[PDB]
Amino acid sequence: MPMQMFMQVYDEIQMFLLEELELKFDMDPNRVRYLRKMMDTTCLGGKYNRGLTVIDVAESLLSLDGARRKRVLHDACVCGWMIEFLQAHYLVEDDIMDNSVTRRGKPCWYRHPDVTVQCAINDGLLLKSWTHMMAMHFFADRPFLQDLLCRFNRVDYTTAVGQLYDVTSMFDSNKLDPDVSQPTTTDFAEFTLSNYKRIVKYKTAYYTYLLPLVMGLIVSEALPTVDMGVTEELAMLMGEYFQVQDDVMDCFTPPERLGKVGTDIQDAKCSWLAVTFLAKASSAQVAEFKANYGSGDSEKVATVRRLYEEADLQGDYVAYEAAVAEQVKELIEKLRLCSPGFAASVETLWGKTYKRQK
Amino acid sequence: MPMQMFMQVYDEIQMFLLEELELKFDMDPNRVRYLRKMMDTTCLGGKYNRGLTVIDVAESLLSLDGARRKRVLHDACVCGWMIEFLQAHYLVEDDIMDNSVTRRGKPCWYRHPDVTVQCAINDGLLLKSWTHMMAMHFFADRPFLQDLLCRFNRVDYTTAVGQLYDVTSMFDSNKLDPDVSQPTTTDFAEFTLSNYKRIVKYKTAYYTYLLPLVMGLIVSEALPTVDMGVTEELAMLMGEYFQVQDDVMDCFTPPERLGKVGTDIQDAKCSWLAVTFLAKASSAQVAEFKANYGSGDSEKVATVRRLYEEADLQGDYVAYEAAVAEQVKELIEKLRLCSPGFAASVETLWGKTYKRQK
Numbered sequence A, B: 001m002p003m004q005m006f007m008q009v010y011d012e013i014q015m016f017l018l019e020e021l022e023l024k025f026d027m028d029p030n031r032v033r034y035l036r037k038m039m040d041t042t043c044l045g046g047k048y049n050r051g052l053t054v055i056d057v058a059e060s061l062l063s064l065d066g067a068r069r070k071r072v073l074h075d076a077c078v079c080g081w082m083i084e085f086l087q088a089h090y091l092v093e094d095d096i097m098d099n100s101v102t103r104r105g106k107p108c109w110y111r112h113p114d115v116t117v118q119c120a121i122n123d124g125l126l127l128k129s130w131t132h133m134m135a136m137h138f139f140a141d142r143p144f145l146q147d148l149l150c151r152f153n154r155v156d157y158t159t160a161v162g163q164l165y166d167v168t169s170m171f172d173s174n175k176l177d178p179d180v181s182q183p184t185t186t187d188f189a190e191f192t193l194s195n196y197k198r199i200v201k202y203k204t205a206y207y208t209y210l211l212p213l214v215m216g217l218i219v220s221e222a223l224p225t226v227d228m229g230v231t232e233e234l235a236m237l238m239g240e241y242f243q244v245q246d247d248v249m250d251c252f253t254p255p256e257r258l259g260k261v262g263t264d265i266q267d268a269k270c271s272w273l274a275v276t277f278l279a280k281a282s283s284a285q286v287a288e289f290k291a292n293y294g295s296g297d298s299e300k301v302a303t304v305r306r307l308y309e310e311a312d313l314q315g316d317y318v319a320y321e322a323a324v325a326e327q328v329k330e331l332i333e334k335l336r337l338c339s340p341g342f343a344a345s346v347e348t349l350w351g352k353t354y355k356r357q358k
Ligand SMILES: O=P(O)(O)C(O)(C[n+]1cccc(F)c1)P(=O)(O)O
Pocket: A090, A091, A094, A098, A159, A163, A166, A203, A204, A246, A260
């Protein structure tokens, strides 16, 4: 049911956008077709957990003829897509920024045969503009419009900030200067857990966990009924854990099931495995690491992979995962004391995160 | 005076943004410094014609206690930067897409020594987010906020759509197909004045001419008082002429004066010169053009340039300019009948456009 309704609204959104382009932007059939393909390829294919959560959080707060339910649930699907389209935008640019080859089993958007990298960058921009176009089209008369968009934009902004932290993590920040070049850090002094948590919090936690919950509460007109301090704590913790899983899979999950080929080591990324490894590594391990990380060379990539394996990072992950699970639990219980319906929707989201396989 | 207050609000905006990142986003001194230079380099240096126009329309509508003048002009300055920051965002991305080397007399942002292309793409995104961040910070209580941002976003969108038309103009659209590679057109059957006008109208006209006048009308609470049909007519006319000038300057203006090195011929762009030349050229002239256009080779490039001068595009430009000057004149009078103060500001705006040199 959730997915069926969500997809019906997707076509409704697509039709509005595509036809408006034809009618008011003087767009030809060829480019409309291109944009329809671009939209489907960049927005469809995932598990839609960010978008579906909005619908689930909205439906579950429906208690605080059917008219209302129909409006609230449809507003929820629109918001769900706003987030899915926002993500799509970031993913298109991110793939370019991370030099990835595939995503969701297919080539990254900018690696498609008839898609130039220069056009891909702009298509990414179109994806984000669409979030605002659909928002105005469906919510122009809603009282929550301003607060809704004010929050959406702040999260958009925090994600861009996190991406800044992500792409500048392997460069000595003390030497960060637009006018003078510098190579990848060679002492990796900044690959610390503190720095890692900051990167992940802003680039993933906010738009992946907090925004779906907040938008769900807003279209449900129940925002004030929840402890926001606890909700944010929960979103931040679940968000970090999700990126950790993302980092681990990048290195150890086969691309067949992952749907995307990892580039974290190649890109010398400040991943969870890298910081956790470096924090426990002996002097010998650190030396060998430094001499193999950040290279495309296949053997040096398998050597970094072996190190992690030898330093029992898989064991470290299990420990961490268990510590997260207990905090989430104590936090959801705190939520439940005043927001039983909301806390249950949160449990569901957790169920889609805990030990996810993809 | 207009230029002194405009820069004053710039410091007020930079301060708010950078300090918020430190306080609320946990940003370090090194990255805050990096972003300060990013903001200065990408947002300062131009003519500020877009931003200054808002201030001038605003001031010229004040008549049709003294604190109101203060408030209205300050809101006008903020709106000016929203546009200037919007443009900064598109220019950062555009330079990467156009593979440009310099802008405003220095390396394009993605060309700065310690600015990687990957971070440059994201820095572009930050610039856009800041337009919304500053707008929320200054206009949170204004009744015009929704309407202001609704128009702003619409124009942001038209630019992106125009950029799509610009970057896919050298590829036979009938074969535009994400999954299939294709080379730059060889028949150039699509390099038509018809297609050229669409590109320019959307990538330049809206954000360069309409938006300034529109935001000016809004902060002075006078949008209703004007004939929008005539207003859009003017903005589109001046906008197209503005881009034609940008196209001509790209090929004939010395980089020392222009501030950037032309890339249109090399990028095989659907420029005013290209379409104009092709529409009047003999079969021999078209052949030569086809064997020299869209090549980095300075000699072939030199040939395209010679083809243009010999076809006397210099003369068509002058005839075009005079026809544009004529129309603008007539529309400005039609505007003057019921909106004299606004028509005056539009006159001033045209005066910064007609035969500009830069
Ligand atoms: O699975 P990936 O590699 O696409 C990723 O999770 C995408 N991504 C995640 C968060 C924000 C973003 F803009 C983009 P990563 O961060 O590049 O590892």
